Amino acid sequence: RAPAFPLSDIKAQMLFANNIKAQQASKRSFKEGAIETYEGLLSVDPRFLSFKNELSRYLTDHFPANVDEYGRVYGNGVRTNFFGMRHMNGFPMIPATWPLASNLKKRADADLADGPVSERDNLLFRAAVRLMFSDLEPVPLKIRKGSSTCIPYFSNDMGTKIEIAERALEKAEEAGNLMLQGKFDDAYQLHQMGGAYYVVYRAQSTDAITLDPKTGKFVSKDRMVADFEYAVTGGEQGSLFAASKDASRLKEQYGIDVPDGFFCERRRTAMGGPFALNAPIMAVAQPVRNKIYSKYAYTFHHTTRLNKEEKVKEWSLCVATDVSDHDTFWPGWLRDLICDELLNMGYAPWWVKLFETSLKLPVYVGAPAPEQGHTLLGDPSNPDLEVGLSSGQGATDLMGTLLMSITYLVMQLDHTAPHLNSRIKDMPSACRFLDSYWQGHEEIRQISKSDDAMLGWTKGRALVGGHRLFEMLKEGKVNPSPYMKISYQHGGAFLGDILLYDSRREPGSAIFVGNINSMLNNQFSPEYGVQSGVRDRSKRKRPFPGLAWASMKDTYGACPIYSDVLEAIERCWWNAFGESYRAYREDMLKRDTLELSRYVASMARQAGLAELTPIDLEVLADPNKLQYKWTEADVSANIHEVLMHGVSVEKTERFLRSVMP
Numbered sequence: 001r002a003p004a005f006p007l008s009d010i011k012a013q014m015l016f017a018n019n020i021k022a023q024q025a026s027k028r029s030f031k032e033g034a035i036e037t038y039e040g041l042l043s044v045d046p047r048f049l050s051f052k053n054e055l056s057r058y059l060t061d062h063f064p065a066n067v068d069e070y071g072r073v074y075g076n077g078v079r080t081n082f083f084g085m086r087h088m089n090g091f092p093m094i095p096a097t098w099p100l101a102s103n104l105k106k107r108a109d110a111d112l113a114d115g116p117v118s119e120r121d122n123l124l125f126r127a128a129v130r131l132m133f134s135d136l137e138p139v140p141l142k143i144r145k146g147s148s149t150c151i152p153y154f155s156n157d158m159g160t161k162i163e164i165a166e167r168a169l170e171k172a173e174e175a176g177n178l179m180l181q182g183k184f185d186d187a188y189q190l191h192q193m194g195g196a197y198y199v200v201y202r203a204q205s206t207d208a209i210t211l212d213p214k215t216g217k218f219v220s221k222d223r224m225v226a227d228f229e230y231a232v233t234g235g236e237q238g239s240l241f242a243a244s245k246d247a248s249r250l251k252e253q254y255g256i257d258v259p260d261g262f263f264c265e266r267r268r269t270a271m272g273g274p275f276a277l278n279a280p281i282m283a284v285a286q287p288v289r290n291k292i293y294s295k296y297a298y299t300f301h302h303t304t305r306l307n308k309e310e311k312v313k314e315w316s317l318c319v320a321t322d323v324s325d326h327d328t329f330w331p332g333w334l335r336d337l338i339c340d341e342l343l344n345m346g347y348a349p350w351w352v353k354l355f356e357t358s359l360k361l362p363v364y365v366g367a368p369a370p371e372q373g374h375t376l377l378g379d380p381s382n383p384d385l386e387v388g389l390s391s392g393q394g395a396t397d398l399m400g401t402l403l404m405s406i407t408y409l410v411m412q413l414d415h416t417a418p419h420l421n422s423r424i425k426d427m428p429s430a431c432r433f434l435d436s437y438w439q440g441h442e443e444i445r446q447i448s449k450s451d452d453a454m455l456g457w458t459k460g461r462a463l464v465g466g467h468r469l470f471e472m473l474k475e476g477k478v479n480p481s482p483y484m485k486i487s488y489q490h491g492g493a494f495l496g497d498i499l500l501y502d503s504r505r506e507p508g509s510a511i512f513v514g515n516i517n518s519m520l521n522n523q524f525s526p527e528y529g530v531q532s533g534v535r536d537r538s539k540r541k542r543p544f545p546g547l548a549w550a551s552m553k554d555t556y557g558a559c560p561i562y563s564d565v566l567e568a569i570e571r572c573w574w575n576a577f578g579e580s581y582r583a584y585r586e587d588m589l590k591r592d593t594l595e596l597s598r599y600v601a602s603m604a605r606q607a608g609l610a611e612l613t614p615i616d617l618e619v620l621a622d623p624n625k626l627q628y629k630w631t632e633a634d635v636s637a638n639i640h641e642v643l644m645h646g647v648s649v650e651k652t653e654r655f656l657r658s659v660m661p
Contacts, residue, residue, distance in 0.1 A: 001232065001233060001234075001236075002101035002102065002231075002232040002233070002234075002377060002378055002385065003377070003378055003379040004228075004232055004375055004376065004377055004378075005375070005376045005379075006374065006375055006376075007026055007027070007374040007375070007376075009376070011376060011379065011380060011381075012026070012364070012374075012375075012376045013026075014152075014195075015151050015152055015195050015196055015198075015364060015376065015380075016151070016152055016154070017152045017153050017154070019153070019154075021153075021154040021155065021156070022152065022153060022154040025150075025154050025198065025366075026364075026374070027374070028366055028367055029367055029370075030367045030369060030370040030371075030372075031367070032090070032091055032092060033090055033091070034088075034089075034090045034091075034256075035089050035090040035526070035528065035529035036529035036530045036531075036532060037089065037524070037526060037529065037530075038530060038545065038588070039530050039532055039545075039588075040532075043088065043089035043090050043529075044088055044089075044090070044256055046257055047576050047577055048524075048576070049257075049259055049262070050259075050575075050576045051524075051572055051573055051575070051576035051577070052085050052086060052524060053086070053259055053261070053262075054572045054575065054576065055082070055085070055520075055524075055568060055569060055572040056081075056082045056083050056085050056086055058568060058572065059082040059520075059565065059568055060081045060082045060083060060211075062564075063076055063078045063082075063561055063564070064078065064081075065078050065079055065080050065081070065491065066078055066079070066491075067079050067080075067490055067491035068501075068505075069474065070470070070474055070488075070505075071320070071474075071488045071489055071490040071491055071492050072491070072492060072499075072501045072505060073491040073492060073493070073498055073499060073500065073501065074500065074501050074502065074503075074505075075560070076560050076561050077498055077500060077513050077515075077516055077559050077560040077561060078516065078517070078561065079490070079491030079493070079498060079515070079517070080491070080517065081209070081210065081211075082517060082520060083208075083209035083210065083211070083218070083261075084206035084207065084208070084209065084517065084520075084521065084525070085206060085520055085521070085524050085525050086209050086218070086261060086262055086263070087205060087206065087207070087262065087263060087264065087265050087525065088247050088250065088256075088258070088262055088263070088264060088265070089203075089205055089265060089525055089526070090203075090265070090529075091247065091250065091264045091265060092201065092203065092264055092265055092266075092267040093223060093243035093244055093245045093263075093264045093265070093266060093267060094243060094244050094264075094369045094370070095225060095227075095243060095368045095369030095372060096201050096225060096243065096267040096269065096368040096369065097225040097226050097231075097243075097269055097368070098225070098226045098227060098228050098230065098231035098365060098368060099199060099226075099231060099269050099271075099363055099365065099377070099387060100226060100230070100231050100234065100235065100328060100387065100388075101231055101232050101233075101234065101363075101377050101378060101385050101386070101387065102234035102385065102386045102387075103234070103328055103329065103330075103332070103386055103387065103388050104234060104332070104386055105234040105235045105236065106234070106235055106328070106329070107329060107331065109235070110329075110485060111479070112329070112331075112482065112483060112484065112485070113331075113482040113483055114331075114333060115333045115337075116337070117482045120413075120421060120424055121406075121410055121482075123424060123426075123427065123430040124406045124409065124410065124424070124430060124434065125334065125337055125338075125341075125402075125403075125406050126337065126341045126427070126430075127406075127427070127430040127431050127433075127434045128402050128405065128406050128434065129337075129338050129341040129342060129345070129402070130341065130345060130427075130431060131292075131296070131431060131434055131435060131438070132288055132291070132292055132398070132402060133284075133288060133342060133345060133347070134291070134345075135291065136284070136287035136288060136290075136291060136656065136660060137287055137290065137291075138287060138649060138652050138653035138655075138656040138657070139286055139287055139290065139649060139652060140646035140647055140648065140649045140652055141165060141169075141279065141282055141283050141286065141646060141647040141651075141652050142286065142632065142644045142645070142646040142647075143158070143161055143162070143165065143644060143645055143646065143647070144623075144643065144644055145158055145536070145538045145539050145643065145644065145645060146534075146536070146538070146539025146540070147161075148272060149161060149164055149274075149275035149276075150197075150198045150272035150273060150274060150275060150392075151192070151195045151196055151197075151198055151272070151273075151274040151275075151364075152192055152195060152274070153192070153275075156539075158645055161275070162645075162647060164192075164275055164276065164279070165275070165279040165647055166647060166651060167191070167276075168191060168192070168193070168275070168276045168277070168279040168280060169279060169280060169283060169647075169651060169652070169655045170655075171190070171191045172191075172193075172279075172280040172350075172351070172354065172655070173348070173350050173351075173658065174190070174191070175187040175190065175191045175193045175350075175354065176348075176349070176350025176351055176352075176353045176354045177349075177350045177353075178190070179193075179194075179350075179353050179354070179357060180349060180350060180353050182382075184357075184380065184381055184382060184383060185380070185381050188274075188380065191276055192274055192275075192276030192277070193274065193276045193277040193354065194274065194277065194357070194361075194380055194383070195274045195361075195362075195380050196274070196361060196362040196363055196364045196376060196378075196380055197271035197272060197273055197274075197361055197362075197363045197364065197390055197392055198271065198272040198363075198364050198366065198392075199269060199270070199271055199272075199363055199364060199365045199366045199373075200270050200271070200272060200366060201267045201268070201269060201270060201366070201367075201368065202267070202268055202270045202527070203265045203266065203267050203268070203527060204265060204266040204267070204268050205265060205521065205525035205526065205527055206521050206525045207220070207221055207223070207265075207266040208220070208221030209221070209261070209263065217260075217261070218260070218261035218263075220245040220263040222242035222243075222245075223242065223243050223245070223266050224240050224241065224242060224243075225240070225241065225242075225243045226238065226239075226240055227239055227241075228375070231377070232377065244264075245263040245264045245266070246263065246264070247262050247263045247264050269391075270391050270392070271363065271390055271391045271392035271393075272392045273358065273361075273390070273392040273393055273394065277354060277357075277358055277394075278358070278392075278393070278394040279394075280351065280354055280394075280655070280659075281354065281355060281358055281393070281394025281395055282394045282395075283652050283655055283656060283659075284351070284395075284656065284659060284660075285394050285395040285398055287656065288395075288398055289397075289398070289631060290633075292401075292438075293631065293633065295439075296438040296439060298311065298438065298439055298440030298445070298447070299405065299437075299438045299439075299440060299445070299446050299447055299448060300401070300405075300438070300447075300448070300449070302447065302449065302494070302495055303615070303630070303634055305497045305511075305512040305513065305514065305558060306512065308447065308494055308495070308497060308512050309511055309512045311440070311445075311447060311456075312447070312454065312456060312499070312507050312510070312512075313507065313508055313510075314458065314508075315445070315456035315457065315458060315507040315508075316456075316457055316458055316459050316463055316506075316507065316508075317456060317457040317463065317466045317467065317470070317507065318454055318455070318456050318492075318499070318507035318510075319454065319455045319456070319466065319469070319470050319473070319488065319492075320453075320454045320455075320488065320489040320492025320493065320494065320499065321408065321453050321454070321455060321473075321486055321487065321488060321489065322451070322452075322486070322487055322488060322489040323404065323451040323484050323485065323486055324484070324485045324486075324487070325485075326389070326400060326404075326450065326451040326484065327388050327389045327391060327400075328387075328388040328389075329388060329484055329485070330388045330389035330399065330400070330403060331403070331483070332359075332360075332386045334399070334402075334403050335356065335359045335360075335399070336356075338399075338402070339352055339355060339356045342355070345661060346660075346661035347659060347660065347661065348658060348659050348660075351659045355395075357383050358390075358393050358394060358395075359389075359390065359393065359399075360383040360384060360385055360386070361378070361380075361383050361385065361387075361390065362376055362377055362378030362379065362380050362383065362385055363376075363377050363378065363385070363387065363390075364376050364377075365377060397449070397450060397628075400450030400451065401448065401449060401450050403483070403484075404448060404450055404451060404453065404484070405438070405446065405448055407481055407483045407484060407486075408446050408448065408453055408455055409434075409437060409444075409446065410481070410483070411455075411469070411480050411481050411486065412444045412446075412455065412462070412469075414480070415465055415468065415469040415472070415480060416444065416457065416462040416463075416464075416465025416466045416468070416469055417443070417444055417461065417462035417465060419461055419462075420433075420442075420444075420462075443457065443458050443459075443460035443461070443462050443463070444456070444457055444458075444462050444466075445457070445458070447494065449495060452494060452495055453494075454492070454494050454499075456507070470488070473486075473487055473488040474488065476488070493515060494512075495629060496514075496515055496518055496629065497512040497513065497514060497515065498512065498513050498514070498515050498559075499511075499512060500512065500513050500560075511558070512558075513558040513559045513560065514555050514556035514557070514558055514559045514562075515556075515559070516556060516559045516561060516562065516565055518556075519552070519555075519556045519559075519565070520565070522548065522621075522622065523548075526542065526545075526622075527541070527624065528541035528542060530542060530545060537595065537599065538599060538642050538643060541623070541624065542621065542622060542623075543599075543620055543621075543623060543642070543643070544592040544595065544596055544620045544621060545588065545592065545621055546585065546588030546589045546590075546591055546592035546593075546621075547589065547592050547593065547596070547609070547617045547620050547621050548617060548618060548621035548622070549585045549586065549588070549589045550589060550609050550612075550614075550617045551614035551615070551616075551617030551618050551621075554614035555614055555618060566582075569581050570582055593608055593609055594606060596620070599642050600638060600639070600642060601638065601641075602638055603638075611636075612636065612639070613634075613635075613636060615630060615634050615635060616635060616636050616639045619635055619639070619643070620639065620642070620643070623643050626643065632644075
């Protein structure tokens with residue numbers, strides 16, 4: 001069972017400093033309302049909604065899903081209905097989940113392992129730790145403009161952020177040693193290292209909606225949540241249940257006109273780490289990213305639809321997998337292991353302790369619903385929680401990638417290629433093998449990022465075992481892993497590019513195309529408003545929205561029905577506004593192209609987009625994509641300086657050298 005204090009308790013109060021930003025954060029009440037979809041257009045504007053009720057129905061009709069029995073996608077590229085867009089962007093289901101303080105029961109009830117099951121698996125996890133954290137070169141600690149330091153300051157000043165990071169890099173050592181000693185309160189008071197994650201509820205603009213041919217009414221995918229008693233008990237007491245996506249309450253509450261077949265948004269839980277403590281972790285995490293995106297680029301570094309295509313064209317079989325609820329399942333033990341293995345490689349203990357702690361931290365629940373929240377979970381005097389992989393941690397992507405790359409490789413040895421086991425006998429041989437495997441130099445292969453992956457087999461011994469494995473997934477009565485709950489993607493795709501199989505149904509004669517449905521998501525169901533109130537556009541969640549139109553053709557244009565869908569929009573837009581969408585988006589293009597030349601140094605006063613990668617555009621349109629789809633390397637140096645700002649390398653270098661071996 002888990003400790004839980006109210007905002008009034010000192011342990012709560014101590015999480016927010018004596019200033020307005022912070023205090024408001026502690027009290028923050030349920031907040032809810034429409035978004036400025038584009039400049040001067042509301043997500044709920046009745047004209048826009050009509051455009052949506054029409055465009056959704058039309059495309060769903062005249063282009064249903066081309067996905068075969070083996071979750072392979074062919075023909076038109078369409079892998080589902082277009083009813084996702086049918087939400088009142090800006091209004092949550094009530095209530096949102098309370099975050100579960102311990103996933104141990106969740107995991108055992110789901111028949112998953114409490115540690116590496118074989119001595120071989122134990123070697124492979126620990127091998128990954130060594131390859132990944134081995135030969136790191138110090139880089140600048142890059143920071144994102146207009147992002148909250150969270151506990152305890154909640155600042156946004158890039159000024160104040162650097163001063164905080166630089167500080168935390170000097171006093172990181174003193175703070176770690178403090179915790180190795182069990183003086184957790186002490187470290188947090190002297191250097192803001194400790195405390196808690198702050199729970200914000202980001203939204204998921206587009207979730208399953210379907211049409212029941214029988215009734216004629218619409219159905220939103222129920223989304224199960226926990227109440228407080230469920231969250232603190234690990235699942236023991238309290239209840240689980242579907243949240244109320246019903247959007248009717250808006251007509252009475254705000255007298256907003258709600259058309260038939262429109263529902264509230266899904267709210268995903270999301271966390272903010274005490275920056276004091278993320279800084280030392282990112283100082284290592286970033287150099288790490290750099291090693292595996294270079295040396296091990298086959299399996300880890302992915303850019304365009306053709307970057308991926310080259311790799312999978314040489315496969316004889318391509319199985320696209322798909323993990324369930326990856327984050328809240330991530331095993332507490334993988335952390336204790338990764339930490340033990342680092343300690344051995346010769347990482348400073350104090351740093352390893354800071355790392356360990358960033359994973360067992362308490363969480364402040366903001367406001368899940370009206371009349372709720374304002375509660376701290378777990379005692380910060382002695383961090384014990386087992387929350388899964390905490391979304392705001394300094395290294396979340398690495399923890400996800402390391403856990404899953406080894407899970408998939410294991411699932412491959414287990415089911416298709418027993419003959420290789422003999423290559424894994426001790427630590428060095430383990431490493432020598434993994435190194436070859438990750439470079440793609442073996443008859444089995446993976447491309448992955450955390451929970452998206454495609455697994456491949458080339459002509460060889462393993463090859464037939466692959467088809468059996470695949471078959472076990474199509475049937476799907478057994479889970480092919482001990483570690484997580486795996487299965488096959490229905491209409492497979494990798495990092496938002498769909499895999500287009502032809503008549504052959506072979507990875508040699510297939511191609512990667514843009515997901516057309518993701519265009520409709522980025523354009524009519526954005527995650528945030530335009531923030532026309534924020535002067536500095538580099539701080540906005542969407543700095544230059546109009547630019548996405550330049551890089552649009554370049555991105556989705558390979559999609560089979562690109563042509564059609566643009567016309568579908570244009571017409572449905574016309575019907576609903578008495579305007580040309582194309583025009584609209586074109587004007588918006590010229591505007592932001594100019595506005596940009598103010599933010600870009602070298603460009604400017606009217607020079608155009610000539611020198612910019614399609615990526616560059618998509619990223620400037622949704623910098624959120626830089627945080628899951630691409631990375632610093634994929635974005636033109638000068639564009640990078642618009643969105644991020646770093647800490648002097650003379651300082652990361654000096655710090656990194658007291659951490660590593």
